[PDB]
Amino acid sequence: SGAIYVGNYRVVNRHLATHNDWANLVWEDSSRDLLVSSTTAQGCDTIARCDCQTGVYYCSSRRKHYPVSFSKPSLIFVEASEYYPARYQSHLMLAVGHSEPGDCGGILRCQHGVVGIVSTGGNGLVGFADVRDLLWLDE
Numbered sequence: 001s002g003a004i005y006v007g008n009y010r011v012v013n014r015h016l017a018t019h020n021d022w023a024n025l026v027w028e029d030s031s032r033d034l035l036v037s038s039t040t041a042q043g044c045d046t047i048a049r050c051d052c053q054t055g056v057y058y059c060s061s062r063r064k065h066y067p068v069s070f071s072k073p074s075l076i077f078v079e080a081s082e083y084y085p086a087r088y089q090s091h092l093m094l095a096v097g098h099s100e101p102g103d104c105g106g107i108l109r110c111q112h113g114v115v116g117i118v119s120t121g122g123n124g125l126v127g128f129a130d131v132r133d134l135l136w137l138d139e
Ligand SMILES: NC(=O)[C@H]1CCCN(C(=O)Cc2cccnc2N)C1
Pocket: 015, 033, 078, 081, 083, 084, 089, 099, 100, 101, 102, 103, 104, 119, 120, 121, 122, 123
């Protein structure tokens, strides 16, 4: 679990969005596993606007943060799950690191701010849904 709170927006994994997220929907994209909902309270997370390929993510299944080198956002095949059929997930970045299904939503950050959230994993890999191209989150 986990979310990004920026301005009047909450960014979550689309497969973990709640009834309240869907009732306050702003934008969603199944191909990216992202959903953004509106909030009444002001969020103060900062979104990175950069091309960093190193950062630190929070891993809930270890209660720890890990440093990672990750690939640029790209179209990556993701095997079928209870939430989606087998498909290409877009804007996904992979890195070597520990992840379990419940780790989805953990934030990846670089020195500029939030980069994205955990969305995929298994086999000593961890995948992050990029949010740096969503310029409207702060303007
Ligand atoms: N974005 C998606 O389609 C995901 C939806 C939930 C299931 N998916 C995983 O990759 C889970 C996973 C397995 C093993 C280790 N870590 C994990 N995060 C795919």
